[PDB]
Design an enzyme around this catalytic site. Structure first.
Site, PDB file in Angstrom:
ATOM      1  CB  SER A  61      -1.027   0.026   1.148  1.00 55.62           C
ATOM      2  OG  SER A  61      -1.992  -0.960   0.890  1.00 55.62           O
ATOM      3  CD  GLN A 117      -9.516  -8.074   2.537  1.00 57.88           C
ATOM      4  OE1 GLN A 117     -10.636  -8.013   3.062  1.00 57.88           O
ATOM      5  NE2 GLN A 117      -8.527  -8.794   3.057  1.00 57.88           N
ATOM      6  CE1 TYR A 147      -5.204   0.179   4.037  1.00 57.42           C
ATOM      7  CE2 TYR A 147      -4.876   2.487   3.524  1.00 57.42           C
ATOM      8  CZ  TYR A 147      -4.478   1.180   3.431  1.00 57.42           C
ATOM      9  OH  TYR A 147      -3.295   0.908   2.761  1.00 57.42           O
ATOM     10  CG  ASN A 149      -6.641  -2.660  -1.049  1.00 58.99           C
ATOM     11  OD1 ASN A 149      -5.842  -1.814  -0.648  1.00 58.99           O
ATOM     12  ND2 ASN A 149      -6.488  -3.957  -0.809  1.00 58.99           N
ATOM     13  CB  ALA A 308       1.509  -5.248   4.391  1.00 56.87           C
ATOM     14  CG  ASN A 333       2.642  -8.071   6.545  1.00 62.79           C
ATOM     15  OD1 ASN A 333       2.851  -7.013   7.147  1.00 62.79           O
ATOM     16  ND2 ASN A 333       1.415  -8.533   6.304  1.00 62.79           N
TER      17      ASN A 333
HETATM   18  B1  LIG Z   1      -2.080  -2.084   1.899  1.00 64.19           B
HETATM   19  O1  LIG Z   1      -2.336  -1.530   3.286  1.00 64.19           O
HETATM   20  O2  LIG Z   1      -0.668  -2.699   2.002  1.00 64.19           O
HETATM   21  C1  LIG Z   1      -3.139  -3.170   1.334  1.00 64.19           C
HETATM   22  N1  LIG Z   1      -3.240  -4.289   2.270  1.00 64.19           N
HETATM   23  S1  LIG Z   1      -3.779  -5.676   1.566  1.00 64.19           S
HETATM   24  O3  LIG Z   1      -4.221  -6.619   2.661  1.00 64.19           O
HETATM   25  O4  LIG Z   1      -4.848  -5.520   0.522  1.00 64.19           O
HETATM   26  C2  LIG Z   1      -2.268  -6.352   0.797  1.00 64.19           C
HETATM   27  C3  LIG Z   1      -2.517  -7.656   0.082  1.00 64.19           C
HETATM   28  C4  LIG Z   1      -2.907  -7.637  -1.244  1.00 64.19           C
HETATM   29  C5  LIG Z   1      -3.147  -8.822  -1.916  1.00 64.19           C
HETATM   30  C6  LIG Z   1      -3.006 -10.025  -1.246  1.00 64.19           C
HETATM   31  C7  LIG Z   1      -2.600 -10.044   0.089  1.00 64.19           C
HETATM   32  C8  LIG Z   1      -2.358  -8.853   0.765  1.00 64.19           C
END
Ligand SMILES: *[B]([O])([O])[C][N]S(=O)(=O)[C]C1=[C][C]=[C][C]=[C]1
EC number: 3.5.2.6
Length: 351
Positions: A61, A117, A147, A149, A308, A333
């Site tokens: 991220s 997600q 927060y 994605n 992460a 991580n």
């Molecule tokens: B960011 O805060 O680093 C997003 N975190 S996440 O859990 O979506 C990272 C991720 C992405 C794909 C698969 C596993 C973890």
């Protein structure tokens, strides 16, 4: 490096690596606008490849800072406005809950509870449309931060639509190339695989898998040199020759919303400096106060972002008024608080 920088870095990071069992790590400190580099351990444990200044790490991220800046550059170009409705760029988003949700809300996680997600089942342009059409907000727009994605990822995808360019092409031509980030990638080319570290999860070597909005939310890979250059660029945007990019960096560090002691930018997050270090969970819903209008980039800030993936842990923090910053890239991580503790210990000492 000056001995003070050498000592605080090694005395902080060596124990961190031991405590967290990190296989490999790279660190850059930016001190009075010059970078100093440090590396430890392994990029690939099985093949015995060391971490070097050319090793690629998954930023996770921290990629959102690149998306926020690309978005900022698109605003500066006049291609988009943060006050634009989302439906202006995606007219197929006809479901009623989208009325009133603007690009600002997407960029800053305030659309009303878009999820962290995107589900793995979502692949195609059609699957994504269906996902967003069916999503039911918990809250009215601009009232709570969650927060996500699926929030800033959609922002990044829509922000590049007027350009005609793919997100990757837009990022390359408008951010990476101008800043000379020549070893920073959304997709690692075969020529550069020799330098792509493995991540480690439960002792297994892993790389991030493809997913919807990956490039936009968590998909950048970079070296410690390029990340130090990214920090320099964000510390001193006025040294940047490309006018809209200089502007875009500034826009990403503006303060749009406040929750507690933190302010939300585009990708970047900020607190007032000096910061209580202890002041710096799967789902964390928090009410936000709008900053009306947004405060332009404040130089006396701790500006940062954690990142992460399954196999990697990254952190970047900088303080514009001190011309000081740090990048920590690891192929495990490990917990966020440990990253922030170490970064603060190093920057506090040098400030
Ligand atoms: B960011 O805060 O680093 C997003 N975190 S996440 O859990 O979506 C990272 C991720 C992405 C794909 C698969 C596993 C973890």
């Amino acid at each position: 490096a000056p001995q003070q920088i050498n000592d605080i870095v090694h005395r902080t990071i060596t124990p961190l690596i031991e405590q967290q069992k990190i296989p490999g790590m790279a660190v850059a400190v930016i001190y009075q606008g010059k970078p100093y580099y440090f590396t430890w351990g392994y990029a690939d444990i099985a093949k015995k490849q060391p971490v070097t200044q050319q090793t690629l790490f998954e930023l996770g991220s921290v990629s959102k800072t690149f998306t926020g800046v690309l978005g900022g550059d698109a605003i500066a170009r006049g291609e988009i406005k943060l006050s634009d409705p989302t439906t202006k760029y995606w007219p197929e988003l006809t479901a009623k809950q989208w009325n009133g949700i603007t690009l600002l809300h997407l960029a800053t996680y305030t659309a009303g509870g878009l999820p962290l997600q995107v589900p793995d089942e979502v692949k195609s342009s059609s699957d994504l449309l269906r996902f967003y059409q069916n999503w039911q907000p918990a809250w009215a727009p601009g009232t709570q931060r969650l927060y996500a994605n699926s929030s800033i990822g959609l922002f990044g995808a829509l922000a590049v639509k007027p350009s005609g360019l793919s997100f990757e092409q837009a990022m390359q031509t408008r951010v990476f190339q101008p800043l000379k980030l020549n070893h920073t990638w959304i997709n690692v080319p075969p020529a550069e695989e020799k330098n792509y570290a493995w991540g480690y999860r439960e002792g297994k070597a892993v790389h991030v898998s493809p997913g919807a909005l990956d490039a936009e939310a968590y998909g950048v890979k970079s070296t410690i040199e390029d990340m130090a250059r990214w920090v320099q660029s964000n510390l001193k945007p006025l040294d940047i020759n490309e006018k809209t990019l200089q502007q875009g960096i500034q826009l990403a560090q503006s303060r749009y919303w406040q929750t507690g002691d933190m302010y939300q930018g585009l990708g970047w997050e900020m607190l007032d400096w000096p910061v209580n270090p202890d002041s710096i969970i799967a789902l964390a819903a928090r009410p936000v106060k709008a900053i009306t209008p947004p405060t332009p980039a404040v130089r006396a800030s701790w500006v940062h972002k954690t990142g992460a993936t399954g196999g990697f842990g990254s952190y970047v923090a900088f303080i514009p008024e001190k011309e000081l910053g740090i990048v920590m890239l690891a192929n495990k991580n490990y917990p966020n608080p440990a990253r922030v503790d170490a970064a603060w210990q190093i920057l506090n000492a040098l400030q």
